[PDB]
């Protein structure tokens, strides 16, 4: 933090607000950040030759809030990679007013990683052959992506220092899923075919079919059971899964804490069933995603090998290897032919969410020991129980809560995948569990 310190000051920074920002200006800044994110997501890059190749990173476009061929190609990568590299350096003991140096080096490294990513994204050939594009065009694309990542970091700091609600990672990820669901519901796009003109949006197609078709019953049947375009049984399943996740996320083990330092403040410490709120979903989706992009790049080179044929066998959906057993089955209908694949997938999704949750409670400092230390340091004690028994009463709840909120969230993802709900299961879980965070922020600011 001293050798690189010269380079850790030049980058811009956000001033902490002098006074507490009201819940009106915070929502205003959140809306401005969201609007900037969306507009940059819809603006194509300059220098692209042909965005006709299959997307190398199609699988991570959801978790990373990315949009191919646009300014927001990396999405929330500048935010995620900076934090990840900071934690990796801290854990490896390479790195230790020091907060300013840490928060400057974080942004300085999250832009070097952003540049490296903007170089890896171009040599993949998704924008065309770099030799044909030329050094000038490649450099211009890299500069555009660098400025976009800088804007991403600035907007995230704007949201986090107090000017807005929540964080960039949650807001952008939830936005790209809510927008996807709303687009698959109201798409003006019309995929023509031999049958005729039909809209790609389920509701718009329902209206078009009820208007232009004489056989109204066969129009309702079609608009409800289309197998080529989003139908209404996939939008009703989305609402049902939303309702189920909403019900199950409201579970909480209300602990009656009672302070002993300043006597008088009795309170409730809620231990939610979803203890790690969608962190198991982010971790599982990130694992599989970054593994499909690897088994997909290693299925072109080194083709026909053994390690490649076991890691994944692509067609682009997997048909064998490890990738096949991690991919959701094509609804419950495609389970009859392959039962072992469905069993392995349902087992993997639960046993990975549970493992990730029970590991994250120890890694993120939310384990029963850490909560007991917080209780001891704040004077909090459980009302009915004793003061030295707080650790036991927390160890009898928090580990089980984390494990079962991993199983529950994995099962909800599996159910959403099996119901054909729009937005996937990861997306519907990442949308609901992030809208609930903003709902909690809303109630907190409105009660304070």
């Amino acid at each position: 933090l001293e050798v690189i310190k010269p380079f850790c000051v030049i980058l811009p920074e956000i001033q902490k607000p002098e006074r507490k920002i009201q819940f009106k200006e915070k929502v205003l800044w959140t809306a401005i950040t969201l609007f900037i994110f969306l507009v940059c997501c819809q603006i194509p890059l300059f220098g692209i030759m042909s965005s006709d190749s299959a997307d190398p990173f199609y699988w991570m476009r959801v978790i990373l809030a990315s949009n191919r061929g646009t300014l927001m190609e990396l999405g929330i990568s500048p935010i995620v990679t900076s934090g990840l590299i900071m934690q990796l350096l801290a854990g490896a003991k390479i790195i230790e007013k020091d907060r300013a140096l840490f928060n400057g080096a974080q942004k300085l490294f999250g832009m070097i990683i952003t540049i490296g990513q903007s170089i890896v994204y171009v040599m993949t050939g998704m924008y065309g052959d770099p030799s044909e594009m030329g050094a000038g065009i490649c450099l211009l694309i890299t500069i555009q992506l660098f400025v976009a990542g800088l804007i991403v970091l600035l907007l995230d700091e704007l949201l986090q220092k107090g000017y807005g609600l929540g964080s960039g990672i949650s807001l952008f990820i939830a936005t790209n899923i809510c927008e996807t669901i709303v687009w698959k519901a109201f798409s003006p796009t019309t995929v023509n075919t031999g049958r005729g003109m039909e809209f790609e949006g389920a509701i718009i197609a329902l209206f078009h079919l009820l208007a232009t078709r004489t056989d109204k019953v066969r129009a309702l049947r079609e608009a409800f059971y289309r197998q080529n375009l989003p139908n209404l049984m996939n939008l009703i399943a989305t609402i049902f899964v939303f309702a189920v996740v909403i019900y199950f996320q409201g579970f909480r083990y209300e602990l009656p804490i009672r302070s002993t330092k300043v006597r008088g403040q009795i309170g409730i410490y809620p231990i939610k069933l979803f203890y790690t709120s969608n962190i198991p979903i982010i971790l599982q989706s990130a694992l599989v995603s970054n593994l499909y992009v690897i088994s997909q790049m290693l299925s072109a080179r080194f083709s026909g090998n053994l390690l490649v044929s076991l890691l994944g066998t692509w067609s682009a959906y997997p048909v064998g290897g490890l990738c096949y057993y991690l991919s959701p089955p094509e609804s419950f209908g495609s389970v009859l032919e392959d039962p072992v694949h469905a069993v392995v997938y349902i087992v993997f999704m639960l046993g990975s969410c549970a493992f990730f949750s029970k590991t994250w409670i120890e890694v993120s400092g939310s384990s029963p020991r850490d909560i007991a230390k917080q209780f001891k340091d704040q004077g909090m004690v459980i009302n009915g129980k004793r003061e030295t028994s707080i650790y036991r009463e927390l160890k009898k709840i928090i580990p089980t809560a984390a494990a079962f909120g991993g199983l529950c969230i994995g099962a909800l993802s599996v159910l959403a995948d099996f119901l054909g709900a729009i937005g996937s299961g990861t997306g519907i879980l990442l949308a609901v569990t992030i809208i609930y965070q903003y709902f909690e922020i809303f109630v907190k600011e409105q009660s304070e």
């Binding site: 900037i36 603006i43 194509p44």
Partner: protein
């Protein structure tokens, strides 16, 4: 060092978008 506010961040975010549009328009009417 440099400590910008939310308003400069919004201005820079809008100017980058505008510059991208100007590049695209210049390319379209130059090609």
């Amino acid at each position: 060092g440099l400590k910008v506010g939310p308003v400069p961040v919004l201005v820079m975010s809008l100017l980058f978008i505008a510059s991208v549009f100007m590049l695209h328009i210049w390319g379209k009417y130059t090609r």
